[model samples]
Target: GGFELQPRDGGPRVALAPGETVIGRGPLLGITDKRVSRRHAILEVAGGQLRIKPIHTNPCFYQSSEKSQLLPLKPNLWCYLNPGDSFSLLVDKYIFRILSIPS
Candidate 1:
């Protein structure tokens, strides 16, 4: 997934670089909810695999198939998000779907 975070709030998508990305808060991918996890996760690209790690106590998750079977992706660890995959940032629940880089 080329760092394409399609925020549910419908502002815009995210694009990024070599490594060291901070997700959550501000104009980059900020939702209206100020109480959501600020700087919630760390994102990086590893050999074409886009992966993310939750920052602290925020409840984060990854889903490929039925999210009804959703489960928490362990914090302090990396979770792989391939192209067309999706993840949930649930400080109160925000779904960001990844699309392949448009460019």
Candidate 2:
């Protein structure tokens, strides 16, 4: 009864259950962006909120209606996301867009 992340360009959708979901440049997360890190970020959901943590020492960013902010997920830090928030990462000439789906 909650939301899930659907890929914008024909990739499979991932469920945002009450637990940790991993994302990266690998096929496991349905990500084909060549520049993405193999172990890039983690999305944690509890209650009705979502938080993003960068697992790899790569660049992570959050895009909002106002602006795009860099997420320095240094070790144990995380970036909180709103309902309509969008996040993205880049590498190897590939830009990946992380979209948030609502229930």
Candidate 3:
């Protein structure tokens, strides 16, 4: 119950833990966006830390706090995450917010 994923499309919320969670158009996270690849990205937890990465060279962005702009995410790169960190997968036109509850 420490980590959760919130999707902008009003789909069901997801709970995650110390492992990899796949986001895609398939059954894993069955997103409807046509631009999203079948296996778009990942929410990863490793050694008690969280990270995000692209799975299919999909476009990802991290939201800028001051400018309200998106910063490009490198494909297949692991982006570190903190509690309350949020990002958008532009290929899917979706926003995801991370929730980390204190252990």
Candidate 4:
């Protein structure tokens, strides 16, 4: 019941119900970049895991574990996130950690 994309450091959490949702440059992400696409990423929540994928031409970076750099996520490929997984979008680069945590 608590799948969320939480900004690094201390921004508010973006909560998700069990369903598919889109992520992009909007209030939900605090992204207002003109370079970011309308549909940058897609997230699906179900079955005890959250699935995410890049849907835009611009790169989406992902890091599934700690101590590794975020690598470019290939457009349209699903990446499963448990907890503490993180990702970033193109350039001004806000970072967010995926969580299954209770708040």
Query: On a 0 to 1 TM-score scale, where does candidate 4 land against the true structure?
Result: 0.88
Clashing pairs in 3: none
Residue 42, candidate 3: how far off, in angstroms?
2.0
User: Candidate 2 on 9-103: residue-level lDDT in tens?
Assistant: 55676666678877788765566665677778888877766787877766666665465554333544688776556666552223234344543
Report clash pairs, candidate 4.
Answer: none
lDDT of 1 by residue, 1-103 (tens): 3457776567577776757787776667655465556777888875666888988676677876334444788878988776666777763367777766642
Would you list the C-alpha lDDT of every candidate in the order shown?
0.70, 0.61, 0.72, 0.81
Query: How does candidate 3 score on lDDT?
Result: 0.72
Give the residue spans of candidate 1 off by over 4 A. Answer: 32-34, 65-69
Selected candidate, larger TM-score, 1 vs 3: 3
lDDT of 4 by residue, 33-68 (tens): 877877899889987778888999997888875746
Residue 63, candidate 2: alpha-carbon lDDT: 62
Model 3, residue 55: distance off in Å is 2.4
> Per lDDT, what order, best first?
4, 3, 1, 2
* Two-way TM-score contest, 1 vs 2, winner: 1
Off by over 4 Å in 3: 27-30, 64-67
TM-score per model over all chains: 0.77, 0.67, 0.78, 0.88
TM-score winner:
4
- Residue-pair clashes per prediction, in order, are 0, 1, 0, 0
Q: Where's the lowest-lDDT run of ten residues in candidate 2?
A: 91-100
lDDT of 1 at 37: 68
